[PDB]
Symmetry: D2
């Protein structure tokens, strides 16, 4: 029924055999056959399929309202598997501020295999229409993006991809299936870095992919079985377990996000704030029309590098570390940590200023997170 | 010093911090930074590096006398990472009877990216010399191969690859680092399905890669970090643990292999036997010159499909299942299980007859394994 | 600061060595000593102490505002360790409806060792005063109790125990440290079946004990080290992980508890409802004075056994299984499942009627849980 | 059939449901019931029974030729459960040099519950006959003992216990079921610290108990369920896995033991050597009659404390740490590490001299272990 119930009872996460109310961990590579080719429960070799991995795959398929799920050893392994649907000579359109790892994979790995990449400002979907070439075969969008939280119209992108014969892909990491369901809006494939919110506890690196398309699912299963970037059973189990509390965690994060943004907008040491909940944010209405909540990632400007470092040192409850979607709130400075290879003039032009801070809001007490960040900003 | 000591004390598999005599399992995705960019022990994000994965990587680098190790989510993920060293238009030479998963990856995935594949009978290394094109960039060999255990001269292949500017790769799964060390013979990259002997307990799917080449190691690390087929920490731990007993397991397996082959050669219901220890086997002397023991995989012919099925049903201690390198002995029929897509006339021509049985010798009592297989053959 | 922040940042649950933001899993039994008796970080043998177990022990000590924590292989192992503080000839007072496993341990095991047990209705603390003998050395109370949720005044029991030289113990399982902190009210020892709410995911069996008393802590450490009922490192890790979401889970459970009780009180097929939040419940004011929330366990009467079974069959979201404190709501019938050895006339006299149903409210959507239980009751 | 086969195929260590060739890890606390009291596969609550724990219990029952197995959270938890078969006023006879943890549990814990303990030199079984009181109910022996490896006649002790109505218990840790099977010699209960050889990899703390007596098994199951010192599922799995290689490990250890003892007996810096394989060792013939191999624990005298410390520092392959039965060889000095609370004059009288060194032989290369210990002794 409602989302919080679906999180507990959706998918197959119990043991039909013993009745165990949690998915058994099949730390196993192979399976007895009673006769040659007769598999007791459909399993024959864990790379091809493993029951614990099948459990988490059923969960992500259910949560995204798809038919088929796939679990990979990381988010970028899921992305690479999806890109491998294409052939040399094919063209893929991506949002222009796509995740750094995605941009690296496409421009430094897959370009050597003849895949051509164009980065497009998809906040206006007619940019996609202009960028389509005869060889374009895939449209890949994140929304909202990192670290400036740009929003792209999912439904319109799905329609464009249908009309032009493209495979449409949404990286739904920042929103999670709790708030945004791209397959319901016509997208062919949805994927996640489960390393972030889905696992939720900073203790699994994993990717998840869901689709309703039987033929794309067959192709993805073949790619998974042949290139072998599969998630192991212990990590699959920890994913199932972490997803149980996804709804509670996201709701707490959202309460804190709302109060923190109020504080940041009022504070004199903060300039611009980036988050899709802000009414003046580009495509705010598009976001509200395709999602019923918010990501916990916020970016905001302080004056300079020194202020950013001082802010980090002055907080008690914000942890300096890579990644996002933890139960701990995390803080980072993109210009120094993720975007430092880009020359400073280009960073400035793109809005990645020296004082741009990114926080990933965790599940600490809302008042504590607001007060801590405020007093730290007061030290500037 | 000696191999069995190196297996226990080689690599870094203790905790410098607490002194724990086993590698801690770092079920974690990210790491506190004390200042922006200052990593306490070199860790910042588990996809890039994880201490438990670094432990197993140090083990495989030590065991293969290399400098750099890499742990992947499966053997075929390690193979795919190594193939991704190449660009569209490049050509790779493989032994003609390479592992089915390798052939599938190259001919159904990487060929779509412009990688060209030629299958060559490398049991005569001058076949490699003939097959080299101007665009050839990699030579990839298994020895001994599956399921007919063909042997390829590693040292000569390394010399050919050096002379012609090729990256040389040996899939050393069947022999393990306990018996065969391709990097010592001049090969650039050695890799393993750790799913088999290294893990040894049929409970991990994993790949391992080792090299002494700093530049190839940098390229492999970039590919791993960008396409993300990494081994998780629990599986890395179980690998380290299983490798501890590699020497004992391989030695027991070898004692049983010798006695089983004597029995098979004497038995009237068995025709041809395939194993590199047999003096009339092609390149037996090459094998003995590049290895100081034997794989536990043996293939032998009984009369037909019905005899093969009857043999399997009549054994007590041979388990019908996919994979090899378990503590249990495993039995299979390639024509029905791994090679069934090849038309029967082609199978027959290649020696994959309907009665070809493959066994992977485990660590059961030698007398029991000999007697069990013999009495089962007596029922034919 | 506030409880939800303390749950994330309280205790020591990161790695000082690598900075890993989660507690490493020390799957290890022993530790290198650099010189005889010089321990690198205080560890020498995992039965005595293990770093992952020390992490969860620090968490429970912090959450209960104690100084010392202890992790056991189950709730009843924690209880047995605490009972072993006593000697033959000593007397222990327990609430008269104590948990079945506790009653079994004391009356069928520890009584054979000369420990004498008296069951007392502690809802009136003067019953404790009457029951005190010269040999009484321990007062052990649960509040609220199972399955009728009787409430005992913790502060008054602590004062009585101080005055008469008794060790006071509270089994705080049903309330958790999120809502009730017995050590703050003067109790010597607090303990939990961490199998329930603390782990929270029905995937760990564990006990936890906390105290502020240095001498009792030394005695408990000696008992743990000598009788060895220690929690293992994987289970310790899963406990730390599950406790992260304790606050969110308990708050969702409490919202659902309030709405479900409204529904049950209004429903014509339900007679008596047992829960400390009900204003006419005995010692409701005592509960509100010593706790700032509620347990998720509720008991209520339907007409008879047949109605109870029908109710269970008619629900969609209530799972028939033993235990409580899961993310799934659980349903049971004490007269058939936990109390069936008591003769029916005694059960009836005690209020354990054939139609008494117990539910443990999970974290499903509140509206779904209310509507599901209501429609199922409507089928009666 | 033969022991090495039984180690692989004995007990139930596969999944009947999927065919997985390894025991699934049931990280779970409770189990769905299809109707009240109808358990799908006999499971209802993991403290009472867990399928992974049942797997390791079946293994130890099979390996010891018993009917019932029990897995505890440590060796001393298994011992405490067995002692709890007794009542206040009962008397237990133990060998006089029993393991320190056992002596501590009995003389500092169970004596407070009215259990009376007598330490007896059981190397002459008539000492047992003299020590029997009207209240004696249990005879508990280790053989060989620590650290002087005293041997006790198991068959004669079993006969004495039968004749006088005692429960007989053998702590079979040092010999393992691979070499010594006390239940076959008439003993009622056999137990192990599985922390040592059975797990074999220094990564599990665990106890195991086996019996053929249905009534004692029922009593032990009740004690386990009521006091809750159960082994968790991950540790149970690692035990099953480690036991697979028990035979190979013990055989390698025995080859090394034989060569090391030759070296120690010849070396001028070594005085007395303690090991049951030495022909002049007390009850050498008794040991050879009740076992068909040897423990890997050896003790030997060097001159003094300074020589012992120097020896430890001079070795390359002997690791200074507590415990025994690892894949690494371990070295210790009992007078400083396990027996330091005993006054020095008593230690000297008992043979625990300042220069007594204990080694636990691991599975390193035999020549390496001999040569390393010899060169280190040469530095004296
Ligand atoms: C290493 C990296 O490469 C890219 C892609 N990329 C290439 C040029 C370029 C200019 C601006 C921006 Br924004 C992204 C750009 C993003 C990242 C990252 O880690 O964030
Ligand atoms: C699915 C598969 O594809 C191949 C490669 N391949 C293609 C044609 C062909 C002919 C003979 C042999 Br031998 C191998 C061949 C091997 C396998 C396998 O699973 O074994
Ligand atoms: C097996 C069990 O033993 C007890 C204790 N006990 C002994 C007599 C008795 C009468 C009423 C009540 Br209420 C509890 C009683 C509780 C339980 C249980 O599992 O619930
Ligand atoms: C702490 C400990 O207590 C004991 C039992 N115990 C009591 C007196 C005594 C004298 C000699 C010997 Br030998 C053992 C003795 C053994 C150990 C141990 O850790 O080894
Ligand atoms: C309600 C419910 C669903 C249906 O979810 P939708 O969001 O309507 O697609 C699926 N699974 C479970 C367990 C549910 O309770
Ligand atoms: C002997 C030894 C080595 C060296 O091994 P080689 O086979 O000579 O390369 C490495 N590590 C350890 C722990 C050793 O004992
Ligand atoms: C606030 C806070 C505490 C103090 O908790 P109290 O309930 O006041 O005892 C402890 N630890 C952390 C991490 C906190 O944030
Ligand atoms: C041989 C065998 C047994 C019997 O072992 P004994 O030592 O004769 O009691 C049990 N299980 C398996 C799997 C065996 O192979
Ligand atoms: C500006 As539009 C609504 O075509 O993305
Ligand atoms: C910013 As990242 C998830 O590539 O460490
Ligand atoms: C036949 As040749 C020795 O050139 O591989
Ligand atoms: C023969 As296989 C390791 O691809 O199941
Ligand atoms: C009735 As009273 C307040 O002495 O527990
Ligand atoms: C009611 As119970 C936790 O002893 O199964
Ligand atoms: C000396 As005797 C054989 O009675 O133990
Ligand atoms: C000698 As010990 C196993 O009690 O650390
Ligand atoms: Na738009
Ligand atoms: Na669609
Ligand atoms: Na050749
Ligand atoms: Na080289
Ligand atoms: Na009262
Ligand atoms: Na106090
Ligand atoms: Na004797
Ligand atoms: Na018997």
């Amino acid at each position: 029924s409602n989302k919080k119930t679906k999180l507990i009872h959706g998918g197959h996460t119990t043991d039909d055999y013993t009745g165990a109310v949690t998915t058994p961990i099949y730390q196993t590579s192979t399976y007895l056959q009673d006769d040659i080719g007769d598999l007791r429960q459909g399993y024959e070799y864990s790379r091809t399929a493993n029951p614990t991995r099948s459990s988490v795959e059923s969960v992500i398929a259910t949560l995204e309202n798809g038919k088929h799920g796939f679990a990979f050893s990381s988010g970028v392994a899921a992305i690479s598997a999806v890109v491998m649907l294409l052939d040399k000579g094919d063209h893929i359109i991506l949002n222009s501020d796509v995740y750094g790892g995605t941009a690296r994979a496409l421009t430094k790995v897959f370009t050597r295999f003849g895949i051509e990449v164009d980065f497009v400002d998809t906040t206006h979907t007619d940019s996609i229409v202009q960028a389509i070439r005869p060889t374009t075969k895939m449209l890949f969008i994140e929304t909202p993006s990192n670290p400036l939280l740009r929003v792209t119209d999912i439904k319109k992108s799905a329609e464009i991809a249908k009309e032009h014969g493209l495979i449409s892909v949404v990286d739904n990491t920042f929103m999670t299936p709790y708030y945004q369901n791209p397959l319901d809006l016509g997208i062919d494939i949805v994927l996640h870095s489960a390393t972030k919110y889905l696992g939720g506890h900073s203790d699994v690196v994993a990717g998840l992919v869901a689709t309703s398309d039987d033929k794309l699912a067959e192709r993805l299963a073949f790619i998974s079985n042949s290139t072998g970037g599969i998630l192991g059973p212990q990590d699959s189990y920890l994913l199932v377990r972490g997803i149980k509390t996804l709804g509670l965690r996201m709701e707490q994060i959202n309460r804190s996000v709302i109060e923190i943004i109020k504080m940041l907008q009022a504070h004199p040491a903060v300039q611009q704030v980036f988050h899709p909940s802000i009414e003046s944010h580009l495509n705010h209405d598009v976001h509200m029309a395709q999602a019923d909540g918010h990501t916990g990632v916020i970016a905001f400007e302080v004056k300079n590098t020194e202020s950013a470092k001082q802010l980090i040192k002055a907080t008690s409850y914000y942890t300096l570390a890579e990644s996002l979607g933890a139960v701990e709130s995390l803080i980072s400075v993109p210009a120094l940590m993720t975007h430092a290879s880009i020359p400073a003039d280009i960073r400035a032009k793109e809005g990645i200023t020296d004082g741009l801070v990114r926080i990933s809001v965790g599940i600490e007490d809302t008042e504590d997170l607001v007060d801590d960040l405020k007093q730290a900003l007061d030290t500037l």
